[PDB]
Amino acid sequence: SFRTETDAFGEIHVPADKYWGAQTQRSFQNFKIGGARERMPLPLVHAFGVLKKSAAIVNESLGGLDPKISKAIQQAADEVASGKLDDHFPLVVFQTGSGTQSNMNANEVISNRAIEIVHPNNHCNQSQSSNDTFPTVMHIAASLQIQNELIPELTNLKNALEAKSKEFDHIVKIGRTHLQDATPLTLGQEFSGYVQQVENGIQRVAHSLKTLSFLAQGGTAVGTGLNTKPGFDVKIAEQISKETGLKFQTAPNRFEALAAHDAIVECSGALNTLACSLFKIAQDIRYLGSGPRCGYHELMLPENEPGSSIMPGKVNPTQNEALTQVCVQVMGNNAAITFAGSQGQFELNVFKPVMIANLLNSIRLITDAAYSFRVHCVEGIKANEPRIHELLTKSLMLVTALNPKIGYDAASKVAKNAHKKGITLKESALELGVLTEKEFDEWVVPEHML
Amino acid sequence: SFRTETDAFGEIHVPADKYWGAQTQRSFQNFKIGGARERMPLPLVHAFGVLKKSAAIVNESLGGLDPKISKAIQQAADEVASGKLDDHFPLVVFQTGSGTQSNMNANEVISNRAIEIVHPNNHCNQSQSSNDTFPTVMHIAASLQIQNELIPELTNLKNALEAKSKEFDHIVKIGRTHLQDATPLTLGQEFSGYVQQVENGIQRVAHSLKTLSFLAQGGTAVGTGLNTKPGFDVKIAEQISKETGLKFQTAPNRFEALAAHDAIVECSGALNTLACSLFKIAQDIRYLGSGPRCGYHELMLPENEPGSSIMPGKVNPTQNEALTQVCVQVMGNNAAITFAGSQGQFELNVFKPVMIANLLNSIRLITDAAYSFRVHCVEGIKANEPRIHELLTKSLMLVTALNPKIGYDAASKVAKNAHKKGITLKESALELGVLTEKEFDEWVVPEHML
Amino acid sequence: SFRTETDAFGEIHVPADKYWGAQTQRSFQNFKIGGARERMPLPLVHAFGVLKKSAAIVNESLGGLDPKISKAIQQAADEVASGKLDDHFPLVVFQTGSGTQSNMNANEVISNRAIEIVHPNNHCNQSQSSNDTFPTVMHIAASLQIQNELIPELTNLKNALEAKSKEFDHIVKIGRTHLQDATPLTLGQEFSGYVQQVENGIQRVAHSLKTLSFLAQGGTAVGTGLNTKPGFDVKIAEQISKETGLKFQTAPNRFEALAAHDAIVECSGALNTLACSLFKIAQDIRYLGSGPRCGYHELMLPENEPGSSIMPGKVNPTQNEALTQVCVQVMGNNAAITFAGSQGQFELNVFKPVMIANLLNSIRLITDAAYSFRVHCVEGIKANEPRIHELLTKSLMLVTALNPKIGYDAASKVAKNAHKKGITLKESALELGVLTEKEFDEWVVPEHML
Amino acid sequence: SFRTETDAFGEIHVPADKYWGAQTQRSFQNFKIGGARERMPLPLVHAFGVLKKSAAIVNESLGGLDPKISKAIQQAADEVASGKLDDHFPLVVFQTGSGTQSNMNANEVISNRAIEIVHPNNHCNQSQSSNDTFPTVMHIAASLQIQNELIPELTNLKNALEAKSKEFDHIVKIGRTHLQDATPLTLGQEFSGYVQQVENGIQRVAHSLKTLSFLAQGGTAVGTGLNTKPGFDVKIAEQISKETGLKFQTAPNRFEALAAHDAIVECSGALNTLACSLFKIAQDIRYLGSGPRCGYHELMLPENEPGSSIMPGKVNPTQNEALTQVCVQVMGNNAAITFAGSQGQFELNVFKPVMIANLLNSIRLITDAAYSFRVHCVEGIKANEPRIHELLTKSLMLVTALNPKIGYDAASKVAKNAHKKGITLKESALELGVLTEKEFDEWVVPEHML
Incomplete structure (x- = not known):
């Protein structure tokens, strides 16, 4: 089932259950780049509600719009921001580079919902x-x-x-x-x-x-x-x-x-x-x-x-x-x-x-x-x-711990020897004429190096 | 409705109507990065069918698998390649960097379809x-x-x-x-x-x-x-x-x-x-x-x-x-x-x-x-x-057309004058002592410049 | 002419007229990537002077260095910052990824200049x-x-x-x-x-x-x-x-x-x-x-x-x-x-x-x-x-200027006609039943559109 | 010392010892972007020689140039390709986006060298x-x-x-x-x-x-x-x-x-x-x-x-x-x-x-x-x-080596135990009821895994 609608380029079959108009339907069939994966980012759809809802309040303030129309657009707009009318924004990212198509998408649906609760261009897109x-x-x-x-x-x-x-x-x-x-x-x-x-x-x-x-x-x-x-x-x-x-x-x-x-x-x-x-x-x-x-x-x-x-x-x-x-x-x-x-x-x-x-x-x-x-x-x-x-x-x-309390020569001999043997600094110091076990710890404490 | 299933980490509720197993269900709830927009690219899902179907034929050749099992995996695999079981691959791109999760996704569903027509690891992933x-x-x-x-x-x-x-x-x-x-x-x-x-x-x-x-x-x-x-x-x-x-x-x-x-x-x-x-x-x-x-x-x-x-x-x-x-x-x-x-x-x-x-x-x-x-x-x-x-x-x-049949000085005077007056080369040549209308064309033909 | 010098890997011929040492000379012949075009960016060379000069003052403060040595390094360091010893930094960008080679380059030259006016590691690179x-x-x-x-x-x-x-x-x-x-x-x-x-x-x-x-x-x-x-x-x-x-x-x-x-x-x-x-x-x-x-x-x-x-x-x-x-x-x-x-x-x-x-x-x-x-x-x-x-x-x-004082239909007829004829809005309005010359200006003033 | 020269924009002081002309000198002082580091890549300078030398031969063939002039441009051109006149190309990369300035640089110097051994535009840049x-x-x-x-x-x-x-x-x-x-x-x-x-x-x-x-x-x-x-x-x-x-x-x-x-x-x-x-x-x-x-x-x-x-x-x-x-x-x-x-x-x-x-x-x-x-x-x-x-x-x-000649249960017990103890597979198999030392090797040879 569909629903014939008008814009300027004439007649077009718009799905029966969707809230959008002709322009959205015509653009939807002209820019199908990337498929549903490229479908216009949702948090952007929600922002249109905030903006259109706000567009209503501020234009009604400036006396440009009839209060009845406003209360209608507002509710419909905030229902977009809410996330209830998400399935009515079928447009992809690669559309008009100005975002015109998605803006018109927001207007068409926030307009058809407003009715249900009128003009896509003169009311919702008023002063913008x-x-x-x-x-x-x-x-x-x-x-x-x-x-x-x-x-x-x-x-x-x-x-x-x-x-x-x-x-x-x-x-x-x-x-x-x-x-x-x-x-x-x-x-x-x-x-x-x-x-x-x-x-x-x-x-x-x-x-x-x-x-x-x-x-x-x-x-x-x-x-x-x-x-x-x-x-x-x-x-x-x-x-x-x-x-x-x-x-x-x-x-x-x-x-x-x-x-x-x-x-x-x-x-x-x-x-x-x-x-x-x-x-x-x-x-x-x-x-x-x-x-x-x-x-x-x-x-x-x-x-x-x-x-x-x-x-x-x-x-x-x-x-x-x-x-x-x-x-x-x-x-x-x-x-x-x-x-x-x-x-x-x-x-x-x-x-x-x-x-x-x-x-x-x-x-x-x-x-x-x-x-x-x-x-x-x-x-x-x-x-x-x-x-x-x-x-x-x-x-x-950890050989630099010994350095002050031993001397660069001894400490390197320890390191030089331990490396060649594949032995630890403790073992090396001991087999060599350097220091003792119960003294090695007295000077080489890990947590004494900031 | 669900359907309890097993893997190793135990029990898990797998949707009743879906063809995947535990592993897919557990990973699906661990890597939900990006939402449905990042859902693993379809043409990749189809390729798994081609590969798994082919994995069957070649492993059956090497005598590694029972023909009955093969005829089953093959049909199920080719139905993936066909595009009928696309809604059973809910995994996103940002999953394991080796693609392990989607491969196991293919196996689990091509296995549960094979049954219906058996083992996710030993049969479908055999020799791979x-x-x-x-x-x-x-x-x-x-x-x-x-x-x-x-x-x-x-x-x-x-x-x-x-x-x-x-x-x-x-x-x-x-x-x-x-x-x-x-x-x-x-x-x-x-x-x-x-x-x-x-x-x-x-x-x-x-x-x-x-x-x-x-x-x-x-x-x-x-x-x-x-x-x-x-x-x-x-x-x-x-x-x-x-x-x-x-x-x-x-x-x-x-x-x-x-x-x-x-x-x-x-x-x-x-x-x-x-x-x-x-x-x-x-x-x-x-x-x-x-x-x-x-x-x-x-x-x-x-x-x-x-x-x-x-x-x-x-x-x-x-x-x-x-x-x-x-x-x-x-x-x-x-x-x-x-x-x-x-x-x-x-x-x-x-x-x-x-x-x-x-x-x-x-x-x-x-x-x-x-x-x-x-x-x-x-x-x-x-x-x-x-x-x-x-x-x-x-x-x-188009002043260089005159050059050979006039001379650089005259041709530049034409150009110099026409520029200052905001007049065309023809008009300029005429008001100046240069050539005639029914001769200007004799030499300045656009399509005489390769 | 050269000048033999020492580091650890032994003897090496350093140019007679240059202020750098062994390490700079050895690295210069190991990383010649890109040629002189990639020669370490000058404003980086100058910053080393500021840093080394400052390294002197602050380490002399902490009593770590002899004042005589300091006054020497300082002058030499500030002469780098000055831009007089630029030809002594021949190192390229693609050297050690930590910048070790250029830092040692700064030290070697700020050291050999200090002498002239002593230690590359213990003095200039002290506490760093x-x-x-x-x-x-x-x-x-x-x-x-x-x-x-x-x-x-x-x-x-x-x-x-x-x-x-x-x-x-x-x-x-x-x-x-x-x-x-x-x-x-x-x-x-x-x-x-x-x-x-x-x-x-x-x-x-x-x-x-x-x-x-x-x-x-x-x-x-x-x-x-x-x-x-x-x-x-x-x-x-x-x-x-x-x-x-x-x-x-x-x-x-x-x-x-x-x-x-x-x-x-x-x-x-x-x-x-x-x-x-x-x-x-x-x-x-x-x-x-x-x-x-x-x-x-x-x-x-x-x-x-x-x-x-x-x-x-x-x-x-x-x-x-x-x-x-x-x-x-x-x-x-x-x-x-x-x-x-x-x-x-x-x-x-x-x-x-x-x-x-x-x-x-x-x-x-x-x-x-x-x-x-x-x-x-x-x-x-x-x-x-x-x-x-x-x-x-x-x-x-500029057809929207007429709109309020004429009406959308007339204004579009003007635009529609002028487009088809390739004529201006003024000319169009006149040949058509619209307005006058000494009135067209009364309403279509360019600078009346914010 | 300089050397006054002409182009069109008038008089200009060109260094005495350099082979370039006015155009190169004027552009050199208009696009000093990046300094000497951005100096036009040498292998590009050499290619101009090959091209200009070749431009000579091929234009002399078509009878467009006097042989004396050619033999002169050729030698000068090949001396660029040689790398002897490199210091006469002082132009940077960020010049005219068409490379006009460097091409004119090649012409001016290959022209002034030709003389020495005549026209920058009519001879060297002939037919190009x-x-x-x-x-x-x-x-x-x-x-x-x-x-x-x-x-x-x-x-x-x-x-x-x-x-x-x-x-x-x-x-x-x-x-x-x-x-x-x-x-x-x-x-x-x-x-x-x-x-x-x-x-x-x-x-x-x-x-x-x-x-x-x-x-x-x-x-x-x-x-x-x-x-x-x-x-x-x-x-x-x-x-x-x-x-x-x-x-x-x-x-x-x-x-x-x-x-x-x-x-x-x-x-x-x-x-x-x-x-x-x-x-x-x-x-x-x-x-x-x-x-x-x-x-x-x-x-x-x-x-x-x-x-x-x-x-x-x-x-x-x-x-x-x-x-x-x-x-x-x-x-x-x-x-x-x-x-x-x-x-x-x-x-x-x-x-x-x-x-x-x-x-x-x-x-x-x-x-x-x-x-x-x-x-x-x-x-x-x-x-x-x-x-x-x-x-x-x-x-x-290397536990999968045992698998065929032992069984999955035993092999995992070996692995499970060795992991918990922080002991090797050999040691584990031995302390457990599995196999012998002079048999472990009979089955676990590293180079038996392709």
Whole structure:
């Protein structure tokens, strides 16, 4: 079953049960690039509700719309923001580069729902263009995915990491520069580096919220105020702030805000920096936890996967593999974002959909993996104290402890001999004319090296 | 409704209507990264059928499996390749970096269907690992998406472009180097550059099929032949060739084939080169067709979108915008592919899922946009002969025609004067002591400049 | 002539006239990657002086060094910072990933100069490692290239752009979205978008100075305080602040500061955002200024290059071409910086030299092109008022001016007719039953559209 | 001292001792971007000689030039190709995007040398433009850097790797998937993966020579034959083949050859694939060789650097660090190459200099590091047989050897017990009711696992 409808290019069969109109139906059959996987990112659909709902309130204020119509659009708009009318946004990312098609998608459905509870162009899109409106929906959603989704789960990741940092603070281990044996440090200090990276990462993405706080709405087709009442920007950007719970200003220069999306390239660059930080932590942990007999085996990773009896003690760091796979995706997504970010042309940058998609995709992926990694990995890591101690005493790096109370020549003879024999520093000092067992400890205490 | 099942980690509720087992159900709830949008690329699911079906035939040959079991797995396997059991592969891309989870997904469902028509590990995964098997499914699918989807639609794109090249072969236009006015060329020659780029692009991706022709299957867990009958590689890689319609060899060095996916980085690099070629063509056309009054307006683009009566003759090059958005995505996807491509570790590269996904995503997107662009744009472009001629005679570049039959001094005086007055070369030559109207044409014929 | 010298690996011939020692000479012949073009970035050489000079003062304070030796190292160190001993740093970028070789290069020469006015390891490298020391020289130089070189020239670029913005503020022009004809805006408003982008760019790079303000010095070999007197970090990072004129703190977590260089990836990401902004401005200007007869020709670009008499009025936007070439290089350099930025391993990231080089190379290039572009292009741009006006009246976009004082039907008939005839809105309104000449102006004033 | 000279823009002081003219001097002071480090890549300067020398021969053939003039230009041109007049090419990369300035640089000096032994434009640049000529110099140099520099040193790298592969062919070691313990393989097989990667890399770059074989020369300003004698392309591209020793054809479509440099993006993509291959090999070796007591220490790396007596047996894999730093640079350089590669505009791509520079820079760097790494690392690597054997017997993976001659239950009890006790499989089997010492060997022979 269908339902004939009109636009301008004439008659067209629109599905009976869907809330969209002709324009959405015609564009849906013109840009089927990528299939359902590329279906316009949901958190962007929800932002249209917030914007259209807000568009109603602020235009009704300026007396441009009849209150009855408003109360109708508002409810319908907030039901989008709610997530009930998600199946009515079938449009893909690779559509018009200005996001015109999805904006018209929002209007058509928020219009047909308003009726049910009238005009797609004159009412819902009143005092707005497809140009100022889209880059406003980008900033809102992005801000919401970060403040509400990312940041929260990013903090948990830091706390869970800091707990273990506290938990392994007494365990002294060997440092590895150039992958080689180095002087000691606590395993807790090792993990406090991971914690600091995560912390910095939070401030980096939290800071990005600032460039996103500036909204284009009010600049219409070219950044010029035309077809808008004076102060609409300030009112709408104020109305949206009250609707989201976040503070949003209007863009100081409406041209810069439409002609380019530098605020996305920045933010992406911050997420990109975070991805580097998480790659290092995830690779370390999997190396540190590798084994059981032919690897570091310093840490013991949880076995969230079912193991074969024939291979006991074998656990693949699958939460590390999934995390590192995510991280790379972001590096690639950011790459895609910067080229598109330089491709603006005159008054408008027609690479919006592809930019905000990769940005939204990066945020979703990060949050999911950050969560998955915390719960399924870090929240259960435990130290292999016997292995760690085994490897401390076998190393020749703790030879500098003797140096002041022995002399460089004797201490090197100890190291030189122990290396050639494949014996420990204690054993070497003893077989040689150096010191005693109940004295070696008097001077070579691991925890006496900061 | 559910259905309790077993694996090793115990009991687990598996949906009643789905064909998968415990392992798939446990992993599905451990790696929900990205949601349904990241759901493992379908053409990869289909390749598992081809491989498992082939795994049956070749293992039955080596006498390792009971014929009854085989006939069962075969039908079930080919029903995956068919696309009937697609809703039973709910796994995402960011799972185990070896693709183990999706391979086990294929086995569990091809096993439960086999019954219905028995063992997930001993029968379906017989003589194969999750390590040699996955990079084999990557090459098969990729090869199939290119030979059957891409290349075909890429040729049409070239033919449609070459038709117009032939069609506008008589139309002489101005060349634009440094975006400035230059000597003439036919609009057909302009379009024959687009055609050549497309042609080169085809040979570039067609050539990539070669590195993909080499299959890992037979190398098991580390590239070593262990747990495989001798010649299984040659038989299976032969059996798969007969099953796909394409020629596939087995990889000469099974280690290089598991430890790294350089064949994906190459192919991606070829798709990446193609994307550059299509960006240039798409941008040209939109500039060439811009207007109506304040742009080049050399070409007239189809109006596939409904236009407002108040703005006649206005047509946004929406098939150009969608195409360029696609192209950038590929540049980004390739970026993501090269880092992952260098991150192999020892005997295995655990960045497989993310690599083949971006590769499959690039191919789908390209084909879709290549099609969409042909039909909705190039297949209807028409020249604005009056505009083109208007701009030919206004230019001062056709001044070199007079040079031999006049002299450098006179010809520059013509150009110098016409520029200062904002008059044409004809008008200038006449008001000055140079030549006649019925003689100017005798020497300045546009089509006398190769 | 040479000069035999010693280290440990024995005898080696060191050039007679050079100030370096054995280690520098041995490494110079082991890593000749890239030739003189890759010779370690000078501003990095100068920073070593600042650091070594400061290393002297602060270690003399802690009583670790004899005042005579100090006064000697100080003068020699400041002569490096001065730029007199530049020809004594022959080391390339692709050397040890920790920057050990260049640090030892600084020590050897600052030692042999100190003599002349003693120990390379015990005196100049006193209380410091090649690990904490290098990432400190990176931050200092980078901070100095930005505060002293970049930012300054970036502001001039903004002022020169804002002057012209003021200068063309009265000139009304047509807007170009989707490259198509749109509603009007002043050319000054167009240029105020360029100005805003530049302004944002400054705050973006100026902000990056913050992450760079944190110095590693004091963390030695692993981020652990070992082999350093307590408070050396705070004193040295304080002494360096007084030496540079810039405020520098010490890194809160010394591990994060050696294991990763996220502060470079961030800053680079900011320079990367700036490059996008400058690409758009530079491309616009060259398109806007293209012609003379077959292009926009809205602006008139300076002719800094010698033109052929036969081709008058032809000027290639060579300062635009050089600028856009620079911008891309930065996009590539940033790419190189992010991979290296994720490749840290345990306690140390051995991809330092390559990271800070690309960062320094980006800053130099930007400043040079920003300067070159200002002086040789923007500082002389002038508007082609007659062309601009010619194109305003030819467009059909100023049809919405009549709308309120005429009606949508009449106004579209004007537009519909004028389009078909290739006539202006004025001419169309007149030949049709619409309005008068001395009334058309009463309602269609360009500067009545915000 | 100087020497006044003329061009068109008037008088200018040209250094007395330099061979260039006005145009070079004026451009040298207009584009000083990056300083001497960005000085136009030498192998590009040499190619101009080959081209100009060839331009002489072929134009003299077509009777366009006086033999006396030719014999003069030829000698002067070949002295550039020789490398004697290198100090007369002071131009940087960021100049005119068409390479016009360096082409005019070649002409001015090859003209002033010709005299000494006449016209910069009419003689040396006869029958050629700055447009067809530059992308011809790019292909020639690139082809020469690969055939003569890269490929050769790349083969040595493969042979040196294959020698060691043969040398360690008897040594059985443990495999490491997911960084975990796996089934055995010879260290020679491990190194045969490195060898195969290198081999594939050679064919990949060798293949790229093909797209580069097509030369633009003959297409002049727009790809149109104008201002060229018929067959000049075929003659010149033939004359150049005889001059270089390599086979070069002329480009089939001269437009595609000027409007875009896809052949550089391809080749770069091949070098990019090679860089991934070399990163993996270099990282493995440094991990495999890490230690002495707290790392793998499977291999023993040469100590090309002077070591401190206090730290015996410590050797930093500095040839690995330099190699990996190089590899990343290439990944970045390729990135820079692809954006520039999509930025072609109409008839000409004005991003030539920056594209061929990064390409030449990548080739130089690769060759240098490939050499440095071979000689200073691989050509001296030796196995630590006692460590390898130590780690073989400690692993529980060789438990599948017993399986057929014992049963899954017994074999797992052995593995289960040995794991819990931290004892070897031999010891476990003995203390348990399983088998004997002089029988354990009868079944568990390492070299019985392919």
